[PDB]
Amino acid sequence: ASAVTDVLLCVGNSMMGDDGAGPLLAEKCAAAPKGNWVVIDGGSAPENDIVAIRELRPTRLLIVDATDMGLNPGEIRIIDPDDIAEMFMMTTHNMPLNYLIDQLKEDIGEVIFLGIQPDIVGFYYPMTQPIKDAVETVYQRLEGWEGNGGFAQLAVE
């Protein structure tokens, strides 16, 4: 037995400034593990991470990604899968993200999508302080995570 329960999929590109939030989280976890999470350093596209996640047979999947939500830099929100669909959130390959989330939810049964608001996103940009702070905030909630980890739902109307 693997004894796997929780899986954390970190999405992003460290070569794209604040889009590096996900890879940064993966780096922190590698250096100092928190909780029971198996952490996937997913990079730019979640599509090619799906097969591994399903094979891990998790009970709970957390996805962390820098995502423009129209908020102040570094704000953290959980995005409801219905709002993922309504917002037309896309992967880098222009796949609608709700397709992946909704299907994962059928196989896993708790799937949480967590967005962190970037400020600057561009090739070889540095990460800004509010995003570094947000990544620390999420990291510190990984141990003993329950529900939505105490984070607010994104308000989309």
- Is 107 among the annotated ligand-binding positions? no
- For the bound state, the minimum distance from the C-beta of residue 117 to its own copies, rounded and expressed in Å, comes to 24
The encoded tokens of residue 126 equal: 């540095």
Edge-to-edge strand list for the sheet holding 38-43: 38-43, 6-11, 60-66, 111-116, 76-78
Q: Which of 4, 14, 3, 5 is nearest to 122 (CA)?
A: 14
**Is position 100 an interface residue for its own copies (rule: CB under 8 A)?**
yes
Q: Which does 96 bind (CB under 5 to 8 A by kind): Ca ion, its own copies, none?
A: its own copies
Q: Which is nearer to its own copies, 1 or 51 (CB)?
A: 51
- For the bound state, the minimum distance from the C-beta of residue 26 to Ca ion, rounded and expressed in Å, comes to 11
In whole angstroms, give the CA distance from residue 112 to residue 37: 13
- Is 82 among the annotated ligand-binding positions? no
- Coil, helix or strand at residue 134: helix
Q: Which is nearer to its own copies, 69 or 104 (CB)?
A: 104
Q: Which of 62, 50, 68, 33 is nearest to 143 (CA)?
A: 33
Interface with Ca ion by CB under 5 A: which residues? 12, 19, 42-43, 45, 48-49, 65-66, 102-103, 106, 119
Binding-site residues sit at 19, 65, 93
